[PDB]
Enzyme design. Structure first.
Site, PDB file in Angstrom:
ATOM      1  N   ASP A 159       3.698  53.864 -12.729  1.00  0.00           N
ATOM      2  CA  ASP A 159       4.354  54.132 -11.465  1.00  0.00           C
ATOM      3  C   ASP A 159       3.500  53.638 -10.288  1.00  0.00           C
ATOM      4  O   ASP A 159       4.036  53.087  -9.362  1.00  0.00           O
ATOM      5  CB  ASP A 159       4.587  55.608 -11.264  1.00  0.00           C
ATOM      6  CG  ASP A 159       5.695  56.161 -12.100  1.00  0.00           C
ATOM      7  OD1 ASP A 159       6.430  55.513 -12.860  1.00  0.00           O
ATOM      8  OD2 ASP A 159       5.825  57.350 -12.079  1.00  0.00           O
ATOM      9  N   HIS A 173       8.032  47.462 -14.209  1.00  0.00           N
ATOM     10  CA  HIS A 173       8.092  48.913 -14.355  1.00  0.00           C
ATOM     11  C   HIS A 173       8.940  49.369 -15.510  1.00  0.00           C
ATOM     12  O   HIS A 173       8.535  50.259 -16.209  1.00  0.00           O
ATOM     13  CB  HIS A 173       8.606  49.518 -13.063  1.00  0.00           C
ATOM     14  CG  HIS A 173       8.605  51.025 -13.053  1.00  0.00           C
ATOM     15  ND1 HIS A 173       7.441  51.772 -12.908  1.00  0.00           N
ATOM     16  CD2 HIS A 173       9.615  51.911 -13.047  1.00  0.00           C
ATOM     17  CE1 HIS A 173       7.750  53.053 -12.845  1.00  0.00           C
ATOM     18  NE2 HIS A 173       9.060  53.165 -12.924  1.00  0.00           N
ATOM     19  N   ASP A 174      10.141  48.820 -15.660  1.00  0.00           N
ATOM     20  CA  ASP A 174      10.954  49.089 -16.836  1.00  0.00           C
ATOM     21  C   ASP A 174      10.209  48.756 -18.110  1.00  0.00           C
ATOM     22  O   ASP A 174      10.158  49.582 -18.991  1.00  0.00           O
ATOM     23  CB  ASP A 174      12.225  48.297 -16.827  1.00  0.00           C
ATOM     24  CG  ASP A 174      13.292  48.895 -15.932  1.00  0.00           C
ATOM     25  OD1 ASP A 174      12.996  49.837 -15.142  1.00  0.00           O
ATOM     26  OD2 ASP A 174      14.436  48.390 -15.895  1.00  0.00           O
ATOM     27  N   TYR A 201       3.178  64.399 -13.541  1.00  0.00           N
ATOM     28  CA  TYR A 201       1.733  64.139 -13.545  1.00  0.00           C
ATOM     29  C   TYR A 201       1.216  64.437 -12.158  1.00  0.00           C
ATOM     30  O   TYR A 201       1.984  64.703 -11.246  1.00  0.00           O
ATOM     31  CB  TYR A 201       1.431  62.702 -13.936  1.00  0.00           C
ATOM     32  CG  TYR A 201       2.120  61.670 -13.080  1.00  0.00           C
ATOM     33  CD1 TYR A 201       1.666  61.350 -11.795  1.00  0.00           C
ATOM     34  CD2 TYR A 201       3.244  61.042 -13.522  1.00  0.00           C
ATOM     35  CE1 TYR A 201       2.314  60.386 -11.029  1.00  0.00           C
ATOM     36  CE2 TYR A 201       3.923  60.129 -12.749  1.00  0.00           C
ATOM     37  CZ  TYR A 201       3.442  59.786 -11.503  1.00  0.00           C
ATOM     38  OH  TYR A 201       4.144  58.858 -10.747  1.00  0.00           O
ATOM     39  N   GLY A 245      16.525  50.850 -10.521  1.00  0.00           N
ATOM     40  CA  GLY A 245      17.424  51.958 -10.694  1.00  0.00           C
ATOM     41  C   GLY A 245      17.986  51.865 -12.093  1.00  0.00           C
ATOM     42  O   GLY A 245      17.346  52.275 -13.056  1.00  0.00           O
ATOM     43  N   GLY A 293      18.645  49.187 -14.155  1.00  0.00           N
ATOM     44  CA  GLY A 293      18.505  47.801 -14.551  1.00  0.00           C
ATOM     45  C   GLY A 293      18.694  47.693 -16.028  1.00  0.00           C
ATOM     46  O   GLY A 293      19.188  48.631 -16.609  1.00  0.00           O
ATOM     47  N   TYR A 347       7.431  51.309 -18.959  1.00  0.00           N
ATOM     48  CA  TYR A 347       7.975  52.547 -19.547  1.00  0.00           C
ATOM     49  C   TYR A 347       8.342  52.267 -20.994  1.00  0.00           C
ATOM     50  O   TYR A 347       8.175  53.108 -21.886  1.00  0.00           O
ATOM     51  CB  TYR A 347       9.255  53.024 -18.789  1.00  0.00           C
ATOM     52  CG  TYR A 347       9.025  53.854 -17.524  1.00  0.00           C
ATOM     53  CD1 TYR A 347       7.755  54.094 -17.043  1.00  0.00           C
ATOM     54  CD2 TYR A 347      10.099  54.429 -16.832  1.00  0.00           C
ATOM     55  CE1 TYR A 347       7.557  54.877 -15.904  1.00  0.00           C
ATOM     56  CE2 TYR A 347       9.909  55.200 -15.694  1.00  0.00           C
ATOM     57  CZ  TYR A 347       8.638  55.400 -15.219  1.00  0.00           C
ATOM     58  OH  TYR A 347       8.401  56.209 -14.113  1.00  0.00           O
ATOM     59  N   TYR A 401      17.349  45.346 -11.667  1.00  0.00           N
ATOM     60  CA  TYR A 401      16.457  46.253 -12.422  1.00  0.00           C
ATOM     61  C   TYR A 401      16.059  47.525 -11.699  1.00  0.00           C
ATOM     62  O   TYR A 401      15.594  48.443 -12.347  1.00  0.00           O
ATOM     63  CB  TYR A 401      15.171  45.506 -12.903  1.00  0.00           C
ATOM     64  CG  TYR A 401      15.534  44.572 -13.985  1.00  0.00           C
ATOM     65  CD1 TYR A 401      15.840  43.245 -13.726  1.00  0.00           C
ATOM     66  CD2 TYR A 401      15.639  45.016 -15.273  1.00  0.00           C
ATOM     67  CE1 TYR A 401      16.231  42.400 -14.757  1.00  0.00           C
ATOM     68  CE2 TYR A 401      16.033  44.197 -16.279  1.00  0.00           C
ATOM     69  CZ  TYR A 401      16.338  42.887 -16.016  1.00  0.00           C
ATOM     70  OH  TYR A 401      16.764  42.084 -17.040  1.00  0.00           O
TER      71      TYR A 401
END
Length: 121
Positions: free
Chosen positions: A89, A47-48, A64, A29, A31, A51, A27
């Site tokens: 993040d 994290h995926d 940001y 990069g 993933g 998002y 996952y």
């Protein structure tokens, strides 16, 4: 944006996002399939998923701002996408820092056909 994510990762872990966290496991990069290989990979999965909760935002390119108050990451106010992107993040960077002791170079450049299994967000 990846520019800010990259900087968080470096600050937290002492590792460059590319290539330490851009071709790791299933996952980190690129993933998108399989069971995560370890705790670091699970950080990338989460994290995926985070998002994935923001389908009208553009997390790779929307920039940001964040600061550190007493070492801790603090997301500055921006648009609502910028806010949500930053929290995704920040959580990943802290997840990486928390699982640094099990980071394993054997998962770097992990081959796609070994990413087997199924896991929903």
């Amino acid at each position: 944006s990846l520019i800010e994510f990259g900087k968080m990762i470096l600050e937290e872990t002492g590792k460059l996002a590319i290539p330490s966290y851009s071709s790791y496991g299933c996952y980190c990069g690129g993933g998108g399939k399989g069971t995560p290989k370890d705790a670091t990979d699970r950080c990338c999965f989460v994290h995926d998923c985070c998002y994935g909760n923001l389908p009208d935002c553009n997390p790779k390119s929307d920039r940001y701002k964040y600061k550190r108050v007493n070492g801790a990451i603090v997301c500055e106010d921006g648009t609502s996408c910028q806010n949500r992107i930053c929290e995704c993040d920040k959580a990943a960077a802290i997840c990486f820092r928390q699982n640094l002791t099990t980071y394993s170079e054997k998962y770097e450049l992990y081959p796609d056909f070994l990413c087997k299994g199924k896991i929903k967000c």
